[PDB]
Design a binder for these strands. Structure first.
Lengths: 313, 26, 96, 213, 678
DNA sequence: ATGACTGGAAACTTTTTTGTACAACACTCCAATAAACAT
DNA sequence: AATGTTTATTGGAGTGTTGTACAAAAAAGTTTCCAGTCAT
């Protein structure tokens, strides 16, 4: 009902938990396999519509990326097909447009702005009527292409019937990324897909909490006098956490507490001990109106509560 | 006609149009 | 001393039309925004600090770039001043 | 008007619509006391368009192509009578109340079984006068189901009027572009033409405004 | 896999390892199994023949109807443009250079038609005025430097398309500074080297006829930056004497918004001329009559799939592309579903196929629902004979489709003339559109219906002042198509014209007179043809061959619901899984179900800000009871971690679809973007 | 008696400081680029 | 001698950390509409 102190299931794992996730539940596994083969009966149905300037829309449930991987190994062995799976924080519009230059068209990268490359690739596929290209783009609606400048680039390539676009939709706001001025080029053809399978690939961008090994390996390679200062500010933080107007301790009372607990001796040496803390994203200073530099720790409320239990040895 | 005047004017299109056969006698 | 947009000026525009005989002095509606836009190219109004790009003909929160002294002394020197208009400027709006 | 360049290009356009009795021969020369009576009805529908060069030989031409049902207005305030889809004409009507009403005092038009306090039923406040209030998408998903008669299934062509109306200049965006987790929008056009459309598909919006109690 | 365990997404598969280079056609995949391979390629080559010919009719019908609008546009480009050269012949007269001419072309809410409405006009300007056409929109460059850069390439591409004196010349833009003199100097040099010294005096008759002006189009300008649109117009105002600029506006709403985006000083030099474009209120009369009601096109769709198609056109966008894709997805399945639909191909082509049929084609005819009911109604002596013979069956199959086509070629004429004859009915009980009458016609018996019993008194209201100008117009159109095919049916209409023209000069003193007797008789002959050549398709045999009635499977291709698809699949998993062991109800929630099922029925009751700490313990209340494990004993800490591990993965999948959002205002308080109550 | 006094008296205006929200800003980098300095 | 690299260079091309409102949900204050009494 509060933070993370009532339940003992704290610190969510990232790689040490996939060992017990492989044992899935075979609840009616025979009915789930035949559901995937239901869409496999329409193998020779996609090429009868994509060659006329149409696209394939994938929506519904299940892993949308685990279904197109089987269709590529059945009829994509002699056709120019490019699969795009952009989900990690790094996929942009420059890693796709500049990838078909020195591989498909065999030309080194030397474009200038964004609009200079858009009108340069159209002349290569318009004068030639024998340059097919299948775009097996997975999860088109990622998280770094919500702007209107991302669909107008790919929308120009949809006007030609020699370019095949196959994308997947995994969001309830499908017509929110394209209006009537763009549907004339794509000409979306909706096809429901039922797979019923979890996702074990793109799960990385979501917020877990912070690794406890970072706060543990930082004090081992730290000076002995600096560890007593970090363990002193954590005690006064939880005791005053109930106060909603907690603005942080001042610098005058902090300098007096050092000599009371046999710590630092002067002022310039105390500021030198705070250099390895501000660079490790542990504490930071704020421009106070009273001319006093406040001291706070920008971490979670439940993280500091689990630090006093590991220092008992 | 006296009970419909005790509610909101917006819900009048769901009660008068539905019960139009009862509010037209004689 | 507080900002205000242009739609507040339109509220008093249809207020002066009263207490007047039915003639041809009454206007329509699009002439109001055309008369106010002429002061935009003259730099007689100044935003608080930001000019919104998506602002229409309702959200302006502009002010004034004059004073309450030269506006009253520039009435007797203006050529052709109506009688039913000069009395409204001197008074503090006491009638409807 | 005050500039001399405006009257230079306007007086020439009034010559074809003033020299009619001269060509026919019903009015001789030197007669400035009898030509103002016939031209008076011809100037009442043209003096209200100042600083606008659009008024030419194409304004009255639109009325010639409207032999069937002359209720449509094309030329003089053509934005009042335009063509709107069935499920799209209610979008501009429902979004107008979501940009001038609080995010809490909205239960008075749905669940009337609540307990009203009567705050004053103040009037000259900044409500409905400061501008369109920023509203996300949770408000539109709960008000379009009450204006329409039968049920409506939110398919692909239902949410298409949200982004297509941005190009048509009917709603503004909250500055920079948002992500996808429910963006915020505002308004653009007031109720200058909403009342004209509501009187055609049998609708009343005056009884739905919160400022007019 | 091998394309997702790294930090790059550049994975291509070019067929280069194979030595040979072969090409796989499209028609080779139409026969996936035992579905007449010899006939699968024969119906696919005709699929493009009936599609490339109807597109040539669409571009021809759209062009011939806009001739009345094009004539009104060419007059403005030849009277106001001719005075431009005359105004430059004197240095004292400057009455036109102070303003910029602009032809405003208003448009509707449809934006996809901007390519076909302006595409046909582009070819019209190349044969009547200047051939140089500049096209641009708002998605190009919305700035100052890159905006003028795109205009330079437009004037260079439209000039190299003429094989005259110039040829190929590769150009590298690498910078050449430019401003306002780059377009002025290029316009002066292009009028000197192109023609072998033909310019007259004071700029006139440059290109044989008149001087080619610089005309541009603004199809997408309302979404463009308003600050940029007020900078390029104030430059050519004072430089108009050496730079003829023509502007074309394409407002998709109304020209009233122009006064709000442009100030009074900018609009003072813009002679806006309005031109109302042909809306979709009159094009539906031709695109729905010359395509789906002709003899040359044997493809006819049923009212069940046609009425649902017109609803989307009226409830959403109003563009002609709805009819293009409507007859596209339904045509590829017309020959793929029923194999007997391949015979529907005119008349000279259909006769060359019935005489050479396979053994599998006769099995569907004997099992056709619209064919077995006709034999039982006629004679019973041919019910046990046609099921065994092979050569006599072909003689009657080719005879039924001929008599059925006679009913079709006559229905094409008695439908448009009856609509015009019944067009004199006010209030429009059957709709004003030519297809609205067919909507209420294919629902029940025309002569036996509730709505038909009320319109019997409205036709009797027509007296004398209105029954004299109806048949005089319908008879002229009736004779323009009837090529003396059925003289027994077209005779009753001709005899009624001789009676009405004879009574035209006999009603001087005539008011039960002779005219009232014929008034009550002409209403019976019109109703008599209803019981003859106006029966619904459910009566004539062999109607399931060319028609198609299945709107349940045609809505998920062009108007699907991504939100409803994931709504009914989670609240009721029994409709898709189909198993009696896991039967879902309306209130009770299941326990044996994936993580995407229980998590959807739990947060529905939640309001706005709900903590997930007390909600996580409630999710495991149905998981422990679903594993069929004895709860009377104690469990270990390892088994409890597996339940919590899959719970975190379920939260990451809920926010991925866009429904919830974990706010950072407090600790683990995810916000629900859905208000309950409706 | 109801109608007259003082006696107390519940919503209800004000502020308001709180977080957010979105505004710039110096911004490092770039991407030819272009001339120059060799060829 | 007939070219072509270098060679800073440079104006874009983003860039991220800023700062000034911003819109409440409370915090106040502001009497409160009778209550009691007392009489007749």
């Amino acid at each position: 009902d509060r933070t993370l102190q009532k339940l003992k299931r704290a610190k969510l794992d990232q790689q040490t938990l996939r060992n017990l996730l492989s044992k899935v539940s075979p609840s009616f596994s025979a009915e789930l396999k035949q559901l995937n083969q239901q869409y496999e009966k329409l193998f020779h149905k996609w090429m009868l519509q994509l060659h006329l300037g149409f696209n394939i829309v994938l929506y519904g449930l299940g892993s949308k990326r685990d279904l197109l991987e089987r269709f590529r190994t059945t009829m994509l062995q002699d056709s120019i097909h490019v699969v795009i799976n952009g989900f990690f924080p790094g996929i942009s519009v420059k890693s796709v447009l500049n990838s078909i230059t020195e591989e498909v068209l065999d030309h080194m990268g030397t474009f200038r702005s964004i609009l200079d490359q858009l009108d340069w690739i159209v002349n290569k596929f318009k004068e030639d009527s024998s340059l097919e290209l299948f775009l097996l783009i997975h999860n088109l609606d990622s998280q770094m292409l919500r702007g209107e400048k991302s669909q107008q680039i790919i929308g120009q390539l949809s006007s030609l019937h020699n370019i095949y676009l196959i994308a997947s939709i995994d969001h309830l706001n499908a017509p929110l990324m394209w209006d009537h001025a763009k549907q004339s080029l794509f000409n979306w053809l909706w096809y429901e897909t039922t797979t019923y399978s979890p996702y074990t690939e793109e799960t990385s961008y979501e917020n877990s909490s912070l690794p406890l090994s970072s706060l543990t390996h930082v004090l081992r390679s730290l000076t002995p006098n600096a560890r007593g200062i970090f363990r002193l500010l954590i005690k006064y933080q939880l005791d005053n956490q109930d106060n909603p107007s907690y603005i942080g301790l001042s610098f005058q009372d902090f300098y007096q507490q050092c000599r009371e607990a046999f710590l630092v001796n002067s002022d310039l040496t105390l500021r030198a001990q705070l250099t390895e803390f501000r660079d490790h994203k542990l504490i930071r200073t704020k421009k106070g109106t009273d001319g006093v530099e406040y001291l706070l720790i920008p971490v979670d409320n439940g993280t500091l509560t689990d630090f006093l239990e590991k220092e008992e040895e | 006609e006296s009970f419909i005047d005790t509610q909101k004017f917006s819900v009048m299109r769901s009660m008068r149009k539905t019960f139009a056969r009862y509010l037209s006698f004689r | 001393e507080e900002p205000f947009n242009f739609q507040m000026v339109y509220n008093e525009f249809q207020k002066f039309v009263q207490r007047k005989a039915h003639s041809v002095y009454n206007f329509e509606k699009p002439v109001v925004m055309k008369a106010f836009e002429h002061l935009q190219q003259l730099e007689l109004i100044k935003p608080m600090e930001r000019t919104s790009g998506n602002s229409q003909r309702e959200y302006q929160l502009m002010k004034l770039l004059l004073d309450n002294t030269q506006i009253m002394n520039a009435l007797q020197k203006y050529p052709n001043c109506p009688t039913d208009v000069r009395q409204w400027a001197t008074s503090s709006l006491s009638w409807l | 008007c005050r500039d001399l360049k405006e009257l230079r290009h306007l007086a020439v356009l009034n010559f074809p619509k003033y020299c009619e009795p001269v060509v026919k021969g019903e009015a001789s020369e030197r007669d400035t006391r009898k030509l103002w009576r016939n031209i008076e009805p011809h100037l009442k529908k043209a003096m209200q368009t100042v600083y606008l060069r659009e008024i030419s030989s194409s304004q009255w031409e639109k009325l010639q192509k409207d032999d069937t049902d002359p209720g449509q207005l094309k030329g003089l305030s053509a934005h009042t009578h335009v063509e709107l889809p069935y499920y799209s004409k209610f979008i501009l009507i429902a979004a107008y109340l979501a940009s001038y009403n609080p995010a809490r005092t909205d239960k008075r038009f749905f669940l009337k079984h609540h307990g009203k306090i009567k705050k004053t039923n103040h009037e000259k406040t900044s409500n409905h006068l400061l501008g369109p209030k920023p509203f996300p998408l949770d408000r539109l998903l709960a008000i379009l189901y009450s204006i329409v008669d039968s049920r409506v299934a939110p398919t692909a062509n239902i949410f298409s009027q949200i982004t297509s109306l941005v190009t048509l200049q009917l709603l503004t965006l909250v500055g920079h572009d948002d992500q996808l987790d429910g963006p915020k929008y505002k308004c653009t056009v007031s109720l200058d033409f909403i009342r004209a459309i509501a009187r055609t598909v049998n609708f009343d919006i005056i009884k739905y405004l919160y400022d007019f109690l | 896999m091998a394309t997702s365990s790294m930090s790059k997404g550049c994975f291509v598969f070019k067929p280069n390892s194979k030595k040979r280079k072969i090409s796989l056609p499209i028609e080779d995949y139409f026969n996936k199994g035992k579905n007449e391979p010899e006939d699968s390629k024969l119906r696919f080559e005709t699929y493009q023949l009936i599609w490339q010919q109807m597109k040539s009719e669409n571009e021809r019908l759209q062009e011939e109807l806009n001739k009345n609008l094009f004539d009104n546009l060419i007059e403005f480009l030849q009277k106001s443009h001719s005075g431009f050269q005359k105004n430059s012949r004197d240095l004292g007269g400057q009455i036109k250079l102070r303003e910029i001419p602009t032809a405003a072309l208003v448009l509707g809410v449809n934006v996809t038609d901007h390519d076909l409405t302006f595409g046909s006009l582009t070819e019209a300007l190349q044969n009547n005025v200047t051939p140089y056409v500049v096209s641009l929109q708002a998605k190009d460059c919305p700035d100052m430097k890159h905006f003028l850069q795109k205009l330079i390439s437009q004037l260079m591409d439209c000039c190299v398309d003429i094989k005259s004196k110039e040829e190929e010349s590769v150009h590298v833009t690498q910078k050449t500074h430019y401003s306002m003199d780059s377009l002025s100097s290029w316009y002066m040099t292009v009028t000197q080297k192109t023609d072998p010294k033909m310019l007259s005096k004071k700029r006139t008759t440059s290109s044989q006829w008149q001087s080619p002006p610089v005309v541009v189009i603004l199809k997408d300008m309302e979404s463009f930056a308003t600050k940029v649109l007020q900078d390029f117009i104030i430059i050519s105002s004072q430089h108009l004497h050496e730079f003829p600029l023509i502007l074309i506006f394409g407002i998709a709403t109304s020209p009233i918004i122009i006064h709000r985006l442009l100030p009074h000083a900018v609009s003072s030099l813009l002679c806006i001329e309005l031109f109302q474009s042909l809306s979709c209120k009159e094009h539906l009369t031709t695109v729905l009559d010359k395509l789906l009601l002709t003899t040359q096109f044997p493809f006819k769709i049923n009212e069940k799939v046609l009425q649902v198609l017109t609803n989307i056109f009226l409830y959403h966008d109003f563009s002609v592309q709805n009819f293009i894709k409507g007859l596209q997805l339904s045509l590829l399945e017309h020959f793929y579903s029923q194999p007997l639909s391949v015979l529907c191909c005119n008349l000279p082509e259909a006769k060359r196929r019935i005489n050479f049929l396979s053994n599998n084609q006769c099995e569907n005819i004997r099992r056709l629902p619209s064919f077995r009911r006709y034999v039982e109604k006629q004679a019973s002596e041919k019910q046990v004979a046609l099921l065994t013979n092979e050569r006599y069956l072909k003689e009657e199959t080719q005879l039924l489709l001929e008599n059925l086509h006679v009913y079709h070629m006559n229905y094409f004429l008695v439908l448009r003339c009856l609509h015009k004859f019944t067009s004199s009915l006010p209030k429009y009980p059957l709709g004003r559109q030519i297809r609205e009458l067919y909507c209420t016609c294919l629902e029940k018996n025309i002569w036996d219906s509730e709505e038909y019993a009320s319109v019997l008194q409205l036709l009797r209201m027509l007296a004398k002042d209105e029954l004299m100008t109806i048949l005089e117009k319908c008879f002229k159109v009736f004779k323009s198509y009837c090529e003396n095919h059925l003289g027994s049916t077209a005779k009753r209409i001709e005899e009624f014209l001789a009676q009405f023209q004879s009574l035209d000069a006999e009603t001087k003193e005539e008011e039960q007179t002779k005219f009232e007797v014929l008034r009550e008789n002409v209403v019976n002959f019109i109703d008599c043809l209803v019981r003859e050549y106006l029966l619904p398709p459910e009566t004539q045999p062999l109607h399931e061959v060319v028609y198609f009635s299945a709107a349940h499977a045609l809505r998920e291709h062009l108007n699907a619901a991504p939100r409803i698809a994931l709504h009914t699949a989670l609240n009721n998993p029994y409709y898709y899984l189909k198993n009696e062991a896991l039967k879902s109800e309306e209130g009770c929630i299941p326990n044996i179900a994936p993580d995407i099922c229980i998590a959807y029925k739990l947060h529905l009751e939640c309001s706005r800000l709900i903590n997930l700490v007390d909600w996580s313990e409630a999710f495991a209340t149905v998981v422990t009871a679903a594993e069929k494990m004895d709860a009377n004993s104690a469990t270990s800490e390892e088994m409890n971690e597996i339940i919590h591990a899959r719970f975190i993965r379920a939260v990451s999948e809920l926010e991925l679809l866009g429904f919830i959002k974990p706010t950072k205002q407090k600790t683990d308080h995810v916000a629900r973007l859905t208000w309950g109550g409706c």
